Design a protein around this ligand. Structure first.
Ligand code: HEM
Length: 291
C-alpha cells in the first residue's frame, strides 16, 4: 500500500496549535488521574501503540489510518488500559471534528511529551482515516517477558536501529505498569510524570532483584520500590545497548535529541509526504503562549 499524507482541507498551523492547546489544557486540568500521575503517560503510550503495528514489509499498520478506533484493534490485549487515553481525547475530537483520527492520537503523544517538559517533537498532519478492513490483526505489539535479541528483532520490523530503540525506551521513565492491565506492577522511578533521563539512571544505579509478582510474572525490583520489565533490563544485558544506556544516563540533552528524532520517525512510519506537503510543525507549549 501507499499511504500519501493529505492535509485536512484548508487547515494550517494555527488550526493544529489549537488542538494542541486543547489537549494541553485538559492535561492540566485532569491532574488527579492515576494517583496524580496525570494523563501524559498514557497518551504517550497510546501514540506509540497505534504506530507500533506497522510492518515495513507490506506497509500495513502504523499511524495513518487511525484504525485504533475499530473494535478489533481497540480490543487488542496488548492495548488494555489505552481506552483511558481514548476517552480523554474523545471530547477533543468532538470539538475539532475535522482532524483525522491518526492525526489526533499522534498529536496527543507529542503534546504529552512537550507538556511533561520533554523535548519539542516536530509533527506533520496528513493522516487519513481508513476503513475498518485496514485494521491490523492483534499480535503485532511486543511482549515484555523477553530479551534483548527479541527486542532487536522486533524493532527491526519498524526500521529502528539500536540507538533508536534505546532512545525510545527512555519513555519508560513515565507512568507505571498496572497489574490488571499488563500483569506487571509498579513505577520505574520517582519523577514518573516529568520527562527526564531518569530511566537510564535507574537502570544503572539501582540494585535490581528478580522476582515474581502477583500475576506470577517476573520483574526486576529495586529496594527504592521501582521495577523494570525484562525487556527493560535486557538493555543492560546487551553490550551494544548498554553503552547507549550509559550515554543517555550521562547526557540528558543527547537523549532528548535522539528521542525527538526517533519518536517522530516512529509516528511517521509508512507515510508518504508529497513534496508540496507543509513542513513539520513545532508547537508552542501552553507556557510559551502565556496560557
Ligand atoms: C519492548 C518494547 C516495550 C514493551 C514490551 C513495553 C511494555 C509496556 C508495558 C507492559 C507497560 C505497562 C502497561 C500497564 O499495565 O499499564 C508499558 C507502559 C508504558 N509504556 Fe511501554 N513497552 C515498550 C515500549 C515502549 C515505547 C517505545 C514507548 C514510547 C516510546 C512506551 C511508553 C510507555 C509508557 C509511557 C508507559 C506508561 C503507561 C502508563 O503509565 O499508563 N513503551 N509498556
Amino acid at each position: 500500500l501507499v499511504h500519501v499524507a493529505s492535509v485536512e482541507k484548508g487547515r494550517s498551523y494555527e488550526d493544529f496549535q489549537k488542538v494542541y492547546n486543547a489537549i494541553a489544557l485538559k492535561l492540566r486540568e485532569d491532574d488527579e488521574y492515576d494517583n496524580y500521575i496525570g494523563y501524559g503517560p498514557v497518551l504517550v503510550r497510546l501514540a506509540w501503540h497505534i504506530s507500533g503495528t506497522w510492518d515495513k514489509h507490506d506497509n500495513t499498520g502504523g499511524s495513518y489510518g487511525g484504525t485504533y478506533r475499530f473494535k478489533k484493534e481497540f480490543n487488542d490485549p496488548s492495548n488494555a488500559g489505552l481506552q483511558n487515553g481514548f476517552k480523554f481525547l474523545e471530547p477533543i475530537h468532538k470539538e475539532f471534528p475535522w482532524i483525522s483520527s491518526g492525526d489526533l492520537f499522534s498529536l496527543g503523544g507529542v503534546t504529552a511529551v512537550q507538556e511533561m517538559q520533554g523535548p519539542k517533537i516536530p509533527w506533520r498532519c496528513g493522516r487519513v482515516d481508513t476503513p475498518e478492513d485496514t485494521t491490523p490483526d492483534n499480535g503485532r505489539l511486543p511482549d515484555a517477558d523477553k530479551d534483548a535479541g527479541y527486542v532487536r528483532t522486533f524493532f527491526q520490523r519498524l526500521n529502528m536501529n539500536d540507538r533508536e530503540v534505546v532512545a525510545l525506551m527512555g519513555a519508560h521513565a513515565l507512568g507505571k505498569t498496572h497489574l490488571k492491565n499488563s500483569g506487571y506492577e509498579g513505577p520505574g522511578g520517582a519523577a514518573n510524570n516529568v520527562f527526564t533521563n531518569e530511566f537510564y539512571l535507574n537502570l544503572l544505579n539501582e540494585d535490581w532483584k528478580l522476582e515474581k509478582n502477583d500475576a506470577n510474572n517476573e520483574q526486576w525490583d529495586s529496594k527504592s520500590g521501582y521495577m523494570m520489565l525484562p525487556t527493560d533490563y535486557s538493555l543492560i544485558q546487551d553490550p551494544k545497548y548498554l553503552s547507549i544506556v550509559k550515554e543517555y544516563a550521562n547526557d540528558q540533552d543527547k537523549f532528548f535529541k535522539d528521542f525527538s528524532k526517533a519518536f517522530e520517525k516512529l509516528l511517521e512510519n509508512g507515510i508518504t509526504f508529497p513534496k508540496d506537503a507543509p513542513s513539520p510543525f513545532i508547537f508552542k507549549t501552553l507556557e510559551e503562549q502565556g496560557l
